Amino acid sequence: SNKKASDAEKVYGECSQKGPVPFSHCLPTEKLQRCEKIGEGVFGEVFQTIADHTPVAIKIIAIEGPDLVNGSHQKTFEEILPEIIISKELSLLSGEVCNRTEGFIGLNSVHCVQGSYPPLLLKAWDHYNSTKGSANDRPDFFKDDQLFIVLEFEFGGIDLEQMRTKLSSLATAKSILHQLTASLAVAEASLRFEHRDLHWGNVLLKKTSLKKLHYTLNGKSSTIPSCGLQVSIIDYTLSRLERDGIVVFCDVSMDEDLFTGDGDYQFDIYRLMKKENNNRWGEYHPYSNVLWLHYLTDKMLKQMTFKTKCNTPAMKQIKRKIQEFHRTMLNFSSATDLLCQHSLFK
Ligand SMILES: CC1(N)CCN(c2nn3c(-c4ccc(F)cc4F)cnc3s2)CC1
Helix, strand or coil, X not given: CHHHHHHHHHHHHHCCCCCCEEHHHHCCHHHHHCCEEEEEXXXXXXXXXXXXXXXXXXXXXXXXXXXXXXCEECECHHHHHHHHHHHHHHHHHHHCCCCECCCCCCEEEEEEEECCCCHHHHHHHHHHHHHCCCCCCCCCCCCCCCEEEEEEEECCCEECCCCCCCECCHHHHHHHHHHHHHHHHHHHHHHCCECCCCCHHHEEEEECCCCEEEEEECCEEEEEECCCEEEEECCCCCCEEXXXXXXXXXXXXXXXXXXXXXXXXXXXXXXXXXXXXXCCCCXXXXXXXXXXXXXXXXXXXXXXXXXCCCCCHHHHHHHHHHHHHHHHHHHCCCHHHHHHHCHHHC
C-alpha cells in the first residue's frame, strides 16, 4: 500500500507534477487538431503534431488500469518508470562532453495525464485504421479516471523500413551502420546501455545539410560522413542501463509472448538474448547490441534499393566490406569493440 504510493511519487516526480493533470494541460485544442497517428504497438499509440512551430512525436501509454489493452495488461507505475528514466538519460547524451552522441532522440517532456481518450485522437486513430490498418483496439473504452504517460519527443524522421527505396548509395548504407555503431558505443561507455529491441522501425533517418557528424567516446572526438542523413535510435521500452551501480531495466523474465514470435530474425534475437543472460535481465550483456547491429546489417544487404550507381568499383568495394562486416561482426563483444576494432571503420 505504501509501496504503491512510493511508486506513484517517483513517476509524478519524473513529470514535475504533484499528481495527474488533465489531457488538456498537455494537449490543448490546437495541438490535438494537428495530430496524425504515425505508429502503434501493444504499448499504445504514437502521434505526430506541431508544438510551437516544431514537429514532435507523442507516445501515449495507458497505465495503472485494470482493462486489457491490445491484448495485454497495463503497466503499473513501477513498470513504466524504466522507460521514462532511460528516455531522459539518452536524451542527455547530445549535450554531454566525454561521451557525447546525437544518435538517440531528444525527449522534450513527460507527463502523467488523466481522462478518457480525446475524440480528436480517436479521429486520428480511425483515419490510420482506414488507410494503413491497425492491430490495436480502438482506444475508446477508457474512463475519465484513466491515467496515461505522455512522452513528447523531437521528431526524428522516417524509419529505415520506409526508406528501403530512398537511400542514394552503398556509401549511405555504410554511414548509417557507422552512426548506429558509434551511438551504441557511446551509450555503452556512458551508461552500460543495451537497447534490446532495435528492429528497423526503431531506426529513424532525417535529412541533414551537415557533411560531417561528430561524436565523443571516452574523451576522444571523431567524425562520421553524414551522406546527408542523421540517424536517431528510438523506443527504449525493453532497454537497460546503469548509473553508479544501480540498474534500470525492463524485467521481461515472466513475459512469455515476447519469446514466441515467428516470421522474422527479430524474434530469434529475443530468444538468443534470453539464452545468453540466463533470463536475468538486470545483467549487462553489451553483445545484445552486436546482435541487433547484425540484424540491421542483414536488412541493409537484403532489403535496400539504391538510387545512385552501384556498379562502380568504389561502391562494389563498399558492398564487399559491408558483407565482410556482416560475416565477422558476431565475433566482437560490444558496439564499442566493433567501433574501435572492426576494419569497416578504419
Ligand atoms: C512507424 C515508425 N516505426 C516510424 C514513424 N514513427 C515515428 N516515431 N517517432 C518518434 C518516437 C516514437 C516512439 C518513441 F518511443 C520515441 C520516439 F522518438 C520520434 N520521431 C518519430 S517518427 C513511429 C514508428
